[PDB]
Ligand binder design. Structure first.
Ligand code: KFS
Length: 188
């Protein structure tokens, strides 16, 4: 068949009931995730191919970057709570992996200030239990599929994208094969 288990995707042996339809996991410390966001715009291109009524969820992980990696999961919870993912994703990637200007939780906070989130508003969110709950949701979802690597993407808690079974001689063709696979899986 054109799409085959083990080629463009793998099937979870333990399916996760009631999981988000399209669930992406990343880390601001992960070099491939930097490419997935800034060079390939994977999330945007998947979203532009997805059927109607299919929601996309994207979560940060703790297992890279020790203390700061856990700060970044909480900061991503702040980004989701305030709805400013599109404003902070690039400066967070570049601050961690390009310019090496993110070394502390305060440096993370500076990205949000510079992106226009008020200081009192960032701090209220950071300390809020709504943000604690969002952190817990990110952890639970990763635990549900015993996640040990990023980037990763899961469709209906059943299928996991397999990018290494795709051709990368052309970056645009790769992106569209990846997105078409997500669409194919969402339609299973
Ligand atoms: C075109 C392209 C394709 C890639 O394919 C992969 C390979 C492995 C993983 C998971 C992991 O091992 O971290 C994720 C995507 C990666 C980077 C770029 C760029 N520019």
């Amino acid at each position: 068949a054109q799409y085959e288990d083990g080629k463009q995707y793998t099937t979870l042996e333990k399916p996760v009931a009631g999981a988000p339809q399209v669930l992406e996991f990343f880390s601001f410390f992960c070099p491939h995730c930097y490419q997935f966001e800034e060079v390939l715009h994977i999330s945007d291109n998947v979203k532009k191919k997805l059927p109607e009524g299919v929601k996309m969820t994207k979560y940060h992980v703790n297992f890279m970057g020790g203390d700061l990696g856990k700060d970044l999961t909480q900061a991503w919870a702040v980004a989701m709570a305030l709805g400013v993912e599109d404003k902070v994703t690039v400066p967070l990637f570049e601050g961690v992996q390009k310019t090496q200007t993110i070394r502390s939780a305060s440096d993370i906070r500076d990205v949000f200030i510079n992106a226009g989130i008020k200081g009192e508003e960032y701090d209220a969110a950071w300390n809020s239990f709504v943000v604690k709950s969002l952190v817990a949701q990110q952890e639970k979802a990763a635990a549900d599929v015993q996640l040990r690597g990023v980037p990763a993407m899961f469709v209906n808690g059943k299928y996991q994208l397999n990018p290494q079974g795709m051709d990368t001689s052309n970056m645009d063709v790769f992106v569209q094969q990846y997105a078409d696979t997500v669409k194919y899986l969402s339609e299973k």
